[PDB]
Amino acid sequence: TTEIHPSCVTRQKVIGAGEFGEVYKGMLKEVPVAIKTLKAGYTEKQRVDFLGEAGIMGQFSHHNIIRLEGVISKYKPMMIITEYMENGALDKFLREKDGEFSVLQLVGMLRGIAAGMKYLANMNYVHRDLAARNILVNSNLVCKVSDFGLSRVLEDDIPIRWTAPEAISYRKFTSASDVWSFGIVMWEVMTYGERPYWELSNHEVMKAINDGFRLPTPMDCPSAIYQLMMQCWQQERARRPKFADIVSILDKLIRAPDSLKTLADF
Numbered sequence: 001t002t003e004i005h006p007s008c009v010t011r012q013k014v015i016g017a018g019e020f021g022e023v024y025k026g027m028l029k030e031v032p033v034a035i036k037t038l039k040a041g042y043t044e045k046q047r048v049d050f051l052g053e054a055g056i057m058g059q060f061s062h063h064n065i066i067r068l069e070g071v072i073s074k075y076k077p078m079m080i081i082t083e084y085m086e087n088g089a090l091d092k093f094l095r096e097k098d099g100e101f102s103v104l105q106l107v108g109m110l111r112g113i114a115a116g117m118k119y120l121a122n123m124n125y126v127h128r129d130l131a132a133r134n135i136l137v138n139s140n141l142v143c144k145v146s147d148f149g150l151s152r153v154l155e156d157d158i159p160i161r162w163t164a165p166e167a168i169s170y171r172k173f174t175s176a177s178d179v180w181s182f183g184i185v186m187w188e189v190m191t192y193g194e195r196p197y198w199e200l201s202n203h204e205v206m207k208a209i210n211d212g213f214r215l216p217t218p219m220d221c222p223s224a225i226y227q228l229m230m231q232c233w234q235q236e237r238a239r240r241p242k243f244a245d246i247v248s249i250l251d252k253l254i255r256a257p258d259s260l261k262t263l264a265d266f
């Protein structure tokens with residue numbers, strides 16, 4: 001990974017924060033960047049996880065995967081420097097822009113996410129935490145997968161209601177469990193950031209899914225899109241589409257956009 005000298009980086013505005021560091025908007029010398037820091041006194045595990053995220057991101061080069069500019073590791077606090085995504089997290093963005101996009105734009109966002117996920121899957125990377133909150137959006141409406149590492153635990157044991165049944169029941173996370181999650185993201189995007197399963201508890205969601213229930217059709221959702229998200233939610237992993245299938249299908253729909261005028265019954 002590229003080692004960046006601190007004189008080349010200015011932090012301007014905090015845009016995110018946690019117990020162990022913050023995320024800033026800043027400039028890199030001059031281009032806008034995001035800057036994630038690690039606080040002094042970090043543990044060995046913290047360092048491995050922090051620099052681990054940068055190491056994973058630095059292995060990737062794809063339009064729909066957040067681009068690493070480099071790291072500051074020789075000076076402290078340590079920093080990861082990425083491209084700056086002007087519209088922030090997809091979940092919050094959709095909820096602040098409810099109804100403001102065409103169906104074709106929404107489907108385009110999903111194709112981008114699916115292309116990023118295909119690339120990760122093919123690169124032997126299982127995300128485990130695919131959700132609108134972990135996707136970022138630039139000023140071209142390009143959606144990029146973020147949130148990399150191995151630093152994660154399933155809630156009550158990573159939220160349950162985004163996770164595939166096999167990952168919950170026996171800890172089997174694969175690209176096919178990411179496809180399940182992608183189905184949930186599809187529903188997030190087509191609903192402008194509705195919370196999956198609304199106020200159902202985690203245990204009610206699991207029981208509902210095990211009994212065959214699935215999320216209902218979003219309002220004004222193309223039939224083909226709802227059909228695709230339902231296939232992502234097949235109980236049997238081998239019946240789910242691969243990302244390659246999802247990319248292919250979304251591409252065809254986008255290239256024949258009249259196909260999106262046929263709506264699922266709400």
Ligand SMILES: O=C(Nc1ccccc1Cl)c1cnc2ccc(C3CCNCC3)cn12
Nearest residue numbers: 015016034035036080082083084085088089
């Ligand atoms: O996180 C970003 N880059 C990043 C990714 C992985 C590791 C290190 C970094 Cl610096 C990033 C880029 N643009 C934005 C724009 C907004 C935000 C917000 C941070 C807080 N929650 C909402 C999104 C983050 N970003």
